[PDB]
Amino acid sequence: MNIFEMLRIDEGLRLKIYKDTEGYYTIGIGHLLTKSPSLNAAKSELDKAIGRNTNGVITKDEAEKLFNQDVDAAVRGILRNAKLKPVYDSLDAVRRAALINMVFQMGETGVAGFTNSLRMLQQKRWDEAAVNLAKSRWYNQTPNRAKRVITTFRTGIWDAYK
Numbered sequence: 836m837n838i839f840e841m842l843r844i845d846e847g848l849r850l851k852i853y854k855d856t857e858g859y860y861t862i863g864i865g866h867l868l869t870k871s872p873s874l875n876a877a878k879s880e881l882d883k884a885i886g887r888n889t890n891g892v893i894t895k896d897e898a899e900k901l902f903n904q905d906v907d908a909a910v911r912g913i914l915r916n917a918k919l920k921p922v923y924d925s926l927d928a929v930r931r932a933a934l935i936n937m938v939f940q941m942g943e944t945g946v947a948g949f950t951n952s953l954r955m956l957q958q959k960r961w962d963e964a965a966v967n968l969a970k971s972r973w974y975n976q977t978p979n980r981a982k983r984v985i986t987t988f989r990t991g992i993w994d995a996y997k
């Protein structure tokens with residue numbers, strides 16, 4: 836198991852424009868196209884990301900490319916963020932994946948806002964962090980995915996994904 840397999844599980848794979856849990860236009864493996872309500876605007880964003888006239892449909896390879904870019908970006912975002920970097924540096928490899936997962940889903944800004952949880956993680960207070968993380972809109976809106984991630988922070992192993 837690794838970050839890619841982990842996210843592929845959490846996000847799934849769709850080759851056609853779709854709406855995410857929040858009702859936003861997305862495609863591939865969790866690749867958000869736009870928060871705007873127009874399907875047109877989404878199609879425009881799609882064509883621009885892929886470099887061609889897609890008509891809202893992409894290939895698996897194209898999806899995978901968008902995915903690698905997105906993973907890369909999340910990592911780099913973590914590394915560039917003053918609040919995140921220190922946490923990420925302090926974690927073991929499996930837990931780092933968990934943090935990356937959160938960033939991929941909610942963005943740098945979003946997770947950097949989990950001040951208290953971040954501190955607990957940094958202190959290696961697993962169980963406490965787990966409870967604090969659960970007190971969130973995130974957990975309440977996407978509970979199954981949140982449990983998976985939370986369990987991964989709590990145990991440091993991949994069992995929630997096996």
Ligand SMILES: [Cl-]
Pocket residue numbers: 884
């Ligand atoms: Cl892009």
Ligand SMILES: [Cl-]
Pocket residue numbers: 976977978979980981
């Ligand atoms: Cl869920």
